Amino acid sequence: SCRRAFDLYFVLDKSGSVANNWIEIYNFVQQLAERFVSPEMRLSFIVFSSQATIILPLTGDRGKISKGLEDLKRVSPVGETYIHEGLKLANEQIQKAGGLKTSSIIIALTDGKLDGLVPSYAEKEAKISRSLGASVYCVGVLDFEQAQLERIADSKEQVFPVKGGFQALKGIINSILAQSC
Amino acid sequence: NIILSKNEDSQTRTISKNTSTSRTHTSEVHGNAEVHASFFDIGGSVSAGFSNSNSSTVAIDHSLSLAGERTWAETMGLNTADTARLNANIRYVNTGTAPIYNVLPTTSLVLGKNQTLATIKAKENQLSQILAPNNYYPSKNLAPIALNAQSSTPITMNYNQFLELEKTKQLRLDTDQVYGNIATYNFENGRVRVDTGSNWSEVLPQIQETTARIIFNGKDLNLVERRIAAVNPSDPLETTKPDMTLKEALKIAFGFNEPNGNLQYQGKDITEFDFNFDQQTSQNIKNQLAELNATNIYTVLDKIKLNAKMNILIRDKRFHYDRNNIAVGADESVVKEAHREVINSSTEGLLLNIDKDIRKILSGYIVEIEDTEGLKEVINDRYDMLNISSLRQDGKTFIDFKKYNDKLPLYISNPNYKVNVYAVTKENTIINPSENGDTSTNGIKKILIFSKKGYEIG
Amino acid sequence: NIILSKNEDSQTRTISKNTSTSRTHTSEVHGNAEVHASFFDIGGSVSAGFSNSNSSTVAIDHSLSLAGERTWAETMGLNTADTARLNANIRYVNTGTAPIYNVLPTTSLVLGKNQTLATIKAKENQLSQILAPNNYYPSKNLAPIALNAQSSTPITMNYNQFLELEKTKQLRLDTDQ
Amino acid sequence: ANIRYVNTGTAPIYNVLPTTSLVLGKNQTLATIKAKENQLSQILAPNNYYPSKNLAPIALNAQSSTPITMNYNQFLELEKTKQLRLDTDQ
Ligand SMILES: [Mg+2]
């Protein structure tokens, strides 16, 4: 039915390919953390590239949340595009929270321009997410790969282009509240 | 190079990495390896550290081949009840002083301490090509011979084995000494003939039983062998030989010379190499340094009598050495020096004229970026992302940061940072994740080779 | 000349173009080709540009054979899961200063940088003809020898390969000594 | 098993090695090892193990179409003494 406690995961692509439009990604992660301000809205930040890292754990304390936003602000997008690794550090947090016993919303920011095995593993690691009672959101940047993103998130719907009339913020925040009471 | 594949839609279910081979000369251990009682007997197990026998050693490129590949397993798709077939391209190469005109050696490929994966011995007389000195068999300008690929029984390898292979990424190659017959002269009509009546297997042991063996590595870092006409006291005949001196030896054996009165080698001074002898040769020389009152052999050098069966290992004192006596990795000092030279700095890749002798002891380079404050942001942060250093045929090592950054050049948000590109010697480099899954460059011992500012590049 | 056909009503499903062969002497590159570290060693990889070894090179007539033909593919009818058999007429030819009286060389036909398509080595002593200087083996006034066509294992070539062949329309011929 | 020929005399052998037979007990022969002749060109010098101590020891029926058969009663004896015998020709 409906719920109140949501856990948002912010997997961020800090690869060189998206070193230009990093701010947009930060803004989307700032304009989103600015919205959901419910004590039950535990946020978590993650940034991948040559390897992902847990910038902000899963918690609802703006004391550390703002701290994270301050760090994501001072980031230099560079390195390969190992998105799967990021999506992983996301599920690792979920499965440690309760697995299905947790309503999570993984939001991955990337160009969707994966290469080699990354696609295979990303798509797979992504399904590993939806296999834990969670929803995947591919908020791509630049002329991202709509195709890939589709195979990464739930459906072509959870694919919102950061660029637009809040199409992302709106379509997303309103798609998340469409599950709240 | 080798090529591992799942024993028979399969095209990417196969890994193909390159390899680096190099003659070896395995010595003894430190002093604790439990050796059977038959070790302190006569001839029994007393290998005297090193003896007669060719044994090369290969290493499998630990770098990447695809994208986010991980554990050859998932890459290929091998499960407990599966078999993996090995295949590779190898070339026989003579390092001695004489050539072989027909039957090549029967080399056996081993994995670990005794697990033989196969025994390669291409047909006899099948080839008429010549295995001349310092000249790879299948002429470098031809097609390298390929293992079980041109056969009815390939190379079997079970999951447990295929597992080990990954754990070390290295195989061993032992080769016998049965060489084809020998090519001799013929005063009559001055012709070069191959006498079916004389095969090395007959006239070869003698050489090893009436000479001095010296392993030097100056021409490169590859152990070169040579035997000099030493003398034996117990043998009347073998006394008819000209008395030999370690000095004179290093002059004809390899080519050491006396430019201004200093016995050097194409530049390096005889004092830049370490002298290592075997249990026997040790004494035979110690007793000389005794009746000659001296502590430095480099001095009484030209006064050391080389007796048959004597073994000596002259290796460059610069770099460090392993168990097989191979160019492992020198000290940070020498390392840095070789890179002091710069030719072109770019947001794409550095172009240097790094020293060959050095570059050979380097596994790879770690590209990172230090913030004006003190941050350690690294580009290729995975142990398998060290594969960057290229090499133009002009003799200049070309580095590239792009090979590990979405094929796009550097990202300088603030042209005041510090592009820190380190170097990792073989001895230090890692090849597999930690007890956990640390695919990072965290636990490494790299060396600072570069460090220019954002505005000091472009 | 060579003759490519779909590995076994088929009469026009086969392409037959002529070829131009000529001894070669491949030298070194410009100065950037990434060569393994074993290049600046003694004897190792130091081919000194060019050395001892016979290596000819053929090129396939890129012109037309039929009407509006296009892409050998549609011409023959080769699809991903198909095999194409190669065949050709070749002649040994001595260029040196001395003649060979019996066993001819074991030349291997290559495609690309290492893809060997076969290794031709007609029987030894089988011939008593003489391979005199500046004189093609199968006397120009005779019938040119033909690859796997006079054998139990022809010349296998998959779609991907048959594709490359078209992309360059050239094969390589290396010969021993 | 992994075995190695080893010369103890005063002269060397240059080719054909001996035809040694493995026995169990007083007459129960378990096999007769006699690696191919001329197959090897290595030298069996004095006080020097055949497969050079710095190499790979030869292994019985493991590199063959008929291994080494041993029934329960035999396998039993083996345990009862934990010792085999090796006789070699000349
Ligand atoms: Mg990218």
Side-chain angles (χ1 to χ4, degrees):
Chain A
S1 299
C2 66
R3 292 141 292 182
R4 331 90 175 75
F6 296 64
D7 303 303
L8 304 181
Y9 292 118
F10 298 72
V11 172
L12 309 179
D13 176 306
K14 73 165 189 176
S15 69
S17 54
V18 299
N20 301 177
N21 307 59
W22 167 250
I23 183 61
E24 302 185 305
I25 301 176
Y26 172 56
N27 298 306
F28 184 72
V29 177
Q30 201 300 299
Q31 299 180 62
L32 204 60
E34 176 183 299
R35 179 63 178 63
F36 303 117
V37 190
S38 183
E40 300 176 299
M41 289 304 283
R42 299 177 300 178
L43 296 183
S44 184
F45 300 142
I46 299 176
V47 297
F48 68 71
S49 59
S50 303
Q51 194 155 180
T53 53
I54 311 174
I55 311 300
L56 173 66
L58 185 60
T59 183
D61 182 56
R62 279 61 192 180
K64 300 181 180 181
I65 296 179
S66 183
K67 176 63 177 60
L69 293 172
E70 295 182 299
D71 298 303
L72 297 179
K73 182 180 180 61
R74 52 173 297 183
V75 179
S76 184
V78 65
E80 283 287 294
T81 301
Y82 287 143
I83 182 176
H84 55 294
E85 284 291 303
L87 303 183
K88 177 187 176 183
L89 298 181
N91 300 305
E92 183 177 296
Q93 288 289 297
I94 314 175
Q95 183 175 59
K96 185 178 180 180
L100 302 176
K101 302 297 182 300
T102 65
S103 179
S104 302
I105 302 176
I106 300 179
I107 305 174
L109 288 294
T110 179
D111 49 62
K113 304 174 182 178
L114 308 181
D115 178 59
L117 286 182
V118 183
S120 176
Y121 288 99
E123 297 179 57
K124 183 177 181 179
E125 186 61 59
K127 183 172 61 181
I128 299 177
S129 302
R130 297 190 294 295
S131 65
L132 295 175
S135 183
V136 185
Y137 290 70
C138 303
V139 186
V141 183
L142 301 177
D143 60 300
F144 53 67
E145 298 298 302
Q146 178 71 58
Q148 182 60 60
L149 300 180
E150 297 183 302
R151 299 187 295 294
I152 302 178
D154 306 59
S155 66
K156 57 178 60 182
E157 297 186 301
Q158 278 56 59
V159 182
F160 311 74
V162 62
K163 285 191 174 184
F166 297 63
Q167 301 179 61
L169 295 173
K170 301 177 65 178
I172 295 179
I173 297 176
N174 296 303
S175 184
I176 296 176
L177 294 176
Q179 302 174 60
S180 296
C181 310
Chain B
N1 56 60
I2 60 179
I3 180 176
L4 297 173
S5 57
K6 61 176 182 180
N7 193 300
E8 180 180 58
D9 190 4
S10 181
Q11 299 178 59
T12 62
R13 322 299 182 182
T14 61
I15 64 174
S16 181
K17 305 299 179 59
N18 297 61
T19 46
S20 301
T21 318
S22 53
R23 242 180 69 66
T24 78
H25 195 63
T26 61
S27 187
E28 296 186 1
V29 295
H30 303 179
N32 54 299
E34 301 177 299
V35 296
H36 50 302
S38 299
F39 179 64
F40 296 119
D41 297 303
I42 298 182
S45 301
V46 183
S47 55
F50 38 63
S51 64
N52 303 300
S53 184
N54 299 302
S55 178
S56 53
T57 292
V58 304
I60 310 173
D61 179 298
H62 73 305
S63 301
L64 299 173
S65 182
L66 297 178
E69 61 181 61
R70 187 173 181 176
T71 301
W72 292 334
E74 298 188 301
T75 305
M76 284 173 55
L78 297 180
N79 300 299
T80 307
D82 286 299
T83 57
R85 54 183 300 179
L86 171 54
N87 189 302
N89 294 304
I90 55 77
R91 18 188 52 185
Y92 291 105
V93 66
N94 174 38
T95 185
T97 66
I100 309 178
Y101 283 63
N102 44 313
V103 179
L104 274 49
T106 305
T107 174
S108 57
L109 196 173
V110 184
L111 162 55
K113 298 183 64 179
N114 54 57
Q115 288 191 62
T116 64
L117 296 183
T119 52
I120 35 185
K121 176 184 179 293
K123 293 100 295 178
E124 291 60 61
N125 299 301
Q126 181 179 61
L127 70 72
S128 298
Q129 291 73 184
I130 303 72
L131 186 53
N134 293 296
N135 189 53
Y136 295 57
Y137 168 70
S139 300
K140 285 284 194 180
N141 65 67
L142 292 179
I145 255 188
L147 298 183
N148 291 303
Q150 300 180 0
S151 61
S152 67
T153 55
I155 320 175
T156 301
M157 184 171 260
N158 71 60
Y159 197 62
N160 298 180
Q161 302 182 306
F162 177 105
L163 187 59
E164 282 194 62
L165 182 54
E166 181 179 295
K167 184 190 298 180
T168 68
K169 291 187 171 65
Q170 78 163 186
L171 308 177
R172 195 185 69 172
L173 291 181
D174 289 49
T175 307
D176 62 10
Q177 292 188 301
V178 56
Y179 302 177
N181 300 178
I182 309 179
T184 187
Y185 196 58
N186 183 59
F187 55 169
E188 287 292 302
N189 58 54
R191 188 185 298 300
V192 175
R193 181 176 299 182
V194 193
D195 172 56
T196 60
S198 294
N199 178 297
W200 301 95
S201 296
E202 295 184 64
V203 191
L204 191 167
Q206 311 324 78
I207 291 64
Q208 312 186 312
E209 291 293 309
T210 65
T211 61
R213 188 245 287 293
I214 301 177
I215 302 299
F216 174 62
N217 65 314
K219 300 181 180 181
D220 276 302
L221 294 301
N222 296 59
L223 315 187
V224 181
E225 188 170 303
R226 286 299 196 295
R227 286 176 174 287
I228 288 67
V231 301
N232 188 304
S234 303
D235 181 352
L237 175 56
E238 239 45 53
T239 312
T240 309
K241 320 183 75 174
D243 290 292
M244 188 75 289
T245 74
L246 179 55
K247 177 183 180 179
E248 184 89 304
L250 280 70
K251 294 182 63 182
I252 47 185
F254 308 88
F256 280 69
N257 53 303
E258 299 185 63
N260 295 178
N262 294 177
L263 184 56
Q264 69 179 185
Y265 184 69
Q266 298 178 181
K268 301 177 184 177
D269 181 301
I270 176 64
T271 57
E272 292 191 63
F273 309 80
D274 191 57
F275 275 60
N276 288 294
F277 311 117
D278 59 63
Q279 184 175 298
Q280 295 296 303
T281 294
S282 178
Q283 295 291 299
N284 192 301
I285 297 183
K286 177 181 296 181
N287 293 303
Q288 285 181 53
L289 295 175
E291 299 182 301
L292 296 176
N293 292 301
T295 180
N296 190 303
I297 183 176
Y298 299 87
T299 300
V300 297
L301 201 63
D302 55 298
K303 295 181 180 180
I304 312 299
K305 312 296 178 60
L306 297 173
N307 299 180
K309 302 178 181 178
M310 198 175 273
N311 295 180
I312 305 176
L313 176 56
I314 302 302
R315 56 186 190 177
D316 188 304
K317 202 174 181 181
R318 292 191 299 175
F319 331 74
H320 291 182
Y321 287 117
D322 63 358
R323 185 181 180 182
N324 297 60
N325 296 299
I326 324 169
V328 198
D331 298 301
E332 302 182 300
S333 304
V334 187
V335 177
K336 296 186 177 182
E337 184 65 58
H339 304 64
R340 179 183 293 293
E341 297 184 60
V342 181
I343 300 300
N344 182 298
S345 300
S346 179
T347 62
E348 302 179 300
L350 296 177
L351 179 60
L352 294 62
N353 191 60
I354 304 177
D355 188 57
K356 312 303 175 300
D357 295 56
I358 301 300
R359 73 183 313 301
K360 184 161 295 182
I361 64 178
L362 292 304
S363 177
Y365 301 119
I366 304 177
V367 187
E368 69 157 54
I369 294 179
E370 179 181 59
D371 183 294
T372 59
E373 181 180 300
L375 295 179
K376 296 296 182 179
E377 295 177 57
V378 184
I379 310 304
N380 43 290
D381 192 62
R382 292 180 67 177
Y383 74 72
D384 49 54
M385 292 177 89
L386 304 172
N387 177 295
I388 51 180
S389 63
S390 301
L391 179 58
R392 301 179 179 180
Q393 69 77 62
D394 60 52
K396 296 177 179 58
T397 304
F398 175 58
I399 305 179
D400 180 50
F401 317 109
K402 302 191 301 178
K403 194 169 185 174
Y404 287 126
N405 182 63
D406 294 300
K407 302 178 181 180
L408 298 179
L410 286 175
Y411 170 57
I412 307 176
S413 179
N414 184 300
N416 300 63
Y417 291 172
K418 296 179 59 183
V419 179
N420 291 299
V421 177
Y422 309 127
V424 186
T425 58
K426 286 185 171 59
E427 62 179 305
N428 294 304
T429 184
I430 54 177
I431 38 57
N432 290 58
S434 299
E435 291 298 300
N436 41 57
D438 290 345
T439 71
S440 65
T441 58
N442 182 60
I444 302 184
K445 182 180 179 299
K446 65 282 185 176
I447 299 177
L448 184 167
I449 270 57
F450 209 69
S451 179
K452 300 299 294 181
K453 299 298 182 302
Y455 57 109
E456 296 187 59
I457 300 179
Chain C
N1 56 60
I2 60 179
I3 179 176
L4 297 173
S5 57
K6 61 176 182 180
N7 193 300
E8 180 180 58
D9 190 4
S10 181
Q11 299 178 59
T12 62
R13 322 299 182 182
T14 61
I15 64 174
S16 182
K17 305 299 179 59
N18 297 61
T19 46
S20 301
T21 318
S22 53
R23 242 180 69 66
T24 78
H25 195 63
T26 61
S27 187
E28 296 186 1
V29 295
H30 303 179
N32 54 299
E34 301 177 299
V35 296
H36 50 302
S38 299
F39 179 64
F40 296 119
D41 297 303
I42 298 182
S45 301
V46 183
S47 55
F50 38 63
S51 64
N52 303 300
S53 184
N54 299 302
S55 178
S56 53
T57 292
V58 304
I60 310 173
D61 179 298
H62 73 305
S63 301
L64 299 173
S65 182
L66 297 178
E69 61 181 61
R70 187 173 181 176
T71 301
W72 292 334
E74 298 188 301
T75 305
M76 284 173 55
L78 297 180
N79 300 299
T80 307
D82 286 299
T83 57
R85 54 183 300 179
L86 171 54
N87 189 302
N89 294 304
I90 55 77
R91 18 188 52 185
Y92 291 105
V93 66
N94 174 38
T95 185
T97 66
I100 309 178
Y101 283 63
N102 44 313
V103 179
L104 274 49
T106 305
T107 174
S108 57
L109 196 174
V110 183
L111 162 55
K113 298 183 64 179
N114 54 57
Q115 289 191 62
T116 64
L117 296 183
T119 52
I120 35 185
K121 176 184 179 293
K123 293 100 295 178
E124 291 60 61
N125 299 300
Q126 181 179 61
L127 70 72
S128 298
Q129 291 73 184
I130 303 72
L131 186 53
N134 293 296
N135 189 53
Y136 295 57
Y137 168 70
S139 300
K140 285 284 194 180
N141 65 67
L142 292 179
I145 255 188
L147 298 183
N148 291 303
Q150 300 180 0
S151 61
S152 67
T153 55
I155 320 175
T156 301
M157 184 171 260
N158 71 60
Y159 197 62
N160 298 180
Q161 302 182 306
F162 177 105
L163 187 59
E164 282 194 62
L165 182 54
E166 181 179 295
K167 184 190 298 180
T168 68
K169 291 187 171 65
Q170 78 163 186
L171 308 177
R172 195 185 69 172
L173 291 181
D174 289 49
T175 307
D176 62 10
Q177 292 188 301
Chain D
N2 294 304
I3 55 77
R4 18 188 52 185
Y5 291 104
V6 66
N7 174 38
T8 185
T10 66
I13 309 178
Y14 283 63
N15 44 313
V16 179
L17 274 49
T19 305
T20 174
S21 57
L22 196 174
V23 183
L24 162 55
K26 298 183 64 179
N27 54 57
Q28 288 191 62
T29 64
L30 296 183
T32 52
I33 35 185
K34 176 184 179 293
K36 293 100 295 178
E37 291 60 61
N38 299 300
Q39 181 179 61
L40 70 72
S41 298
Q42 291 73 184
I43 303 72
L44 186 53
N47 293 296
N48 189 53
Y49 295 57
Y50 168 70
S52 300
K53 285 284 194 180
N54 65 67
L55 292 179
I58 255 188
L60 299 182
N61 291 303
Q63 300 180 0
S64 61
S65 67
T66 55
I68 320 175
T69 301
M70 184 171 260
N71 71 60
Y72 197 62
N73 298 180
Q74 302 182 306
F75 177 105
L76 187 59
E77 282 194 62
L78 182 54
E79 181 179 295
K80 184 190 298 180
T81 68
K82 291 187 171 65
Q83 78 163 186
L84 308 177
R85 195 185 69 172
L86 291 181
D87 289 49
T88 307
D89 62 10
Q90 292 188 301

